[PDB]
Design a protein around this motif. Structure first.
Motif, short mmCIF file in Angstrom:
data_model
loop_
_atom_site.label_atom_id
_atom_site.label_comp_id
_atom_site.label_asym_id
_atom_site.label_seq_id
_atom_site.Cartn_x
_atom_site.Cartn_y
_atom_site.Cartn_z
N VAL A 61 17.09 -20.19 21.97
CA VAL A 61 16.96 -19.29 23.15
C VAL A 61 17.90 -19.77 24.25
CG1 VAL A 61 15.38 -18.36 24.85
CG2 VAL A 61 14.57 -18.89 22.54
N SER A 62 18.68 -18.89 24.80
CA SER A 62 19.62 -19.32 25.87
C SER A 62 18.83 -19.60 27.15
CB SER A 62 20.64 -18.21 26.14
OG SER A 62 20.01 -17.16 26.86
N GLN A 63 19.39 -20.35 28.06
CA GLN A 63 18.67 -20.66 29.32
C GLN A 63 18.56 -19.38 30.15
OE1 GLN A 63 17.45 -23.99 28.36
NE2 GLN A 63 17.32 -23.69 30.52
N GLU A 64 19.36 -18.40 29.84
CA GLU A 64 19.31 -17.12 30.61
C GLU A 64 18.01 -16.36 30.33
OE1 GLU A 64 23.37 -16.05 29.19
OE2 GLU A 64 23.48 -15.30 31.21
N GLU A 65 17.57 -16.35 29.10
CA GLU A 65 16.33 -15.59 28.74
C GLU A 65 15.06 -16.30 29.23
OE1 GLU A 65 18.97 -14.56 28.33
OE2 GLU A 65 19.43 -14.94 26.26
N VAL A 66 14.97 -17.60 29.12
CA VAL A 66 13.73 -18.28 29.59
C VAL A 66 13.54 -17.99 31.08
CG1 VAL A 66 14.22 -20.07 27.90
CG2 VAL A 66 14.83 -20.42 30.30
N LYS A 67 14.59 -18.03 31.85
CA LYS A 67 14.45 -17.74 33.31
C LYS A 67 13.90 -16.33 33.48
CE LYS A 67 17.97 -20.98 34.76
NZ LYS A 67 16.96 -21.78 35.52
N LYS A 68 14.34 -15.39 32.70
CA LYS A 68 13.81 -14.00 32.83
C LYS A 68 12.31 -14.03 32.56
CE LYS A 68 16.64 -11.83 29.94
NZ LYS A 68 17.06 -10.57 29.26
N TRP A 69 11.89 -14.83 31.63
CA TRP A 69 10.44 -14.90 31.32
C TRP A 69 9.68 -15.26 32.60
CZ3 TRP A 69 10.75 -18.22 26.13
CH2 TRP A 69 11.59 -17.54 25.24
N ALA A 70 10.29 -15.96 33.50
CA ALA A 70 9.57 -16.31 34.76
C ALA A 70 9.68 -15.14 35.74
CB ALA A 70 10.20 -17.56 35.37
N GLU A 71 10.51 -14.17 35.44
CA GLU A 71 10.67 -13.00 36.35
C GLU A 71 9.76 -11.83 35.94
OE1 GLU A 71 12.17 -15.54 36.55
OE2 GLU A 71 14.24 -15.14 36.15
N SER A 72 9.36 -11.73 34.69
CA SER A 72 8.49 -10.57 34.31
C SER A 72 7.93 -10.75 32.89
CB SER A 72 9.33 -9.29 34.34
OG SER A 72 10.26 -9.31 33.27
N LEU A 73 6.69 -10.36 32.70
CA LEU A 73 6.04 -10.47 31.37
C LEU A 73 6.83 -9.66 30.34
CD1 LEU A 73 3.29 -11.66 30.18
CD2 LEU A 73 2.69 -9.20 29.99
N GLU A 74 7.33 -8.53 30.73
CA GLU A 74 8.08 -7.68 29.78
C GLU A 74 9.24 -8.46 29.15
OE1 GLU A 74 9.23 -4.29 31.91
OE2 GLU A 74 7.26 -3.41 31.89
N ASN A 75 9.93 -9.26 29.91
CA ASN A 75 11.06 -10.03 29.33
C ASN A 75 10.55 -10.96 28.22
OD1 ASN A 75 12.53 -10.31 32.59
ND2 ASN A 75 12.92 -8.83 31.04
N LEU A 76 9.47 -11.65 28.47
CA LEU A 76 8.92 -12.59 27.45
C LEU A 76 8.56 -11.81 26.18
CD1 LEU A 76 8.04 -15.33 26.60
CD2 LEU A 76 5.79 -14.85 27.58
N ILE A 77 7.85 -10.73 26.32
CA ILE A 77 7.44 -9.95 25.11
C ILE A 77 8.62 -9.09 24.61
CG2 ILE A 77 6.67 -7.73 26.05
CD1 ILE A 77 4.11 -8.02 24.62
N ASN A 78 9.64 -8.88 25.41
CA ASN A 78 10.79 -8.03 24.96
C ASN A 78 11.89 -8.89 24.33
OD1 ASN A 78 9.51 -5.82 25.85
ND2 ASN A 78 10.47 -5.71 27.80
N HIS A 79 11.76 -10.19 24.34
CA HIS A 79 12.82 -11.04 23.72
C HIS A 79 12.48 -11.32 22.26
CE1 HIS A 79 15.29 -14.64 22.90
NE2 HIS A 79 16.20 -13.86 23.49
N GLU A 80 13.47 -11.36 21.41
CA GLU A 80 13.20 -11.62 19.96
C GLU A 80 12.53 -12.98 19.80
OE1 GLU A 80 16.55 -11.44 17.49
OE2 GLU A 80 15.51 -12.11 15.73
N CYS A 81 12.94 -13.96 20.56
CA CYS A 81 12.31 -15.30 20.43
C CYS A 81 11.04 -15.32 21.27
CB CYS A 81 13.27 -16.38 20.93
SG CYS A 81 12.63 -18.01 20.47
#
Length: 129
Positions: free
Chosen positions: A1-21
């Motif tokens: 997982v890139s550091q760009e996606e984990v930060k999004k997970w802290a911005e919205s639940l949708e990002n965490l559930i919308n990411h393949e990882c």
């Protein structure tokens, strides 16, 4: 997982559930809390959210309601004591917002506890050292 996606997970639940990882990690995280019934319910809710015909919601509503919301269901979904009644009430008038209230609780449920745990979870820390 890139550091760009984990930060999004802290911005919205949708990002965490919308990411393949995030999905794979999130689905694995549910297993840790044994809340995997929530994602199965979410998948059922998505199909429910796509069906816009209130005449087709009844059939699956009863099946999903009887399976996931029946008080005797083996895998009852963790929800407040009033939300289950709301889905039962939708039986009289099944609408697209019938499972939205429950989906909102699942988002709030994992967002209130899974997110706090995810930031402090070992998988997240491994990704975010």
């Amino acid at each position: 997982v890139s550091q760009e996606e984990v930060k999004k997970w802290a911005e919205s639940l949708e990002n965490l559930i919308n990411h393949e990882c995030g999905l794979a990690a999130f689905k694995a995280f549910l297993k840790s809390e044994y809340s995997e019934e929530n994602i199965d319910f979410w998948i059922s809710c998505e199909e429910y959210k796509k069906i816009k015909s209130p005449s087709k919601l009844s059939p699956k509503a009863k099946k999903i309601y009887n399976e996931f919301i029946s008080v005797q269901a083996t895998k009852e979904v963790n929800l407040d004591s009033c939300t289950r009644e709301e889905t039962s009430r939708n039986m009289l008038e099944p609408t697209i917002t019938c499972f939205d209230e429950a989906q909102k609780k699942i988002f709030n449920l994992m967002e209130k506890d899974s997110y706090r745990r995810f930031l402090k979870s070992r998988f997240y820390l491994d990704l975010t050292n």
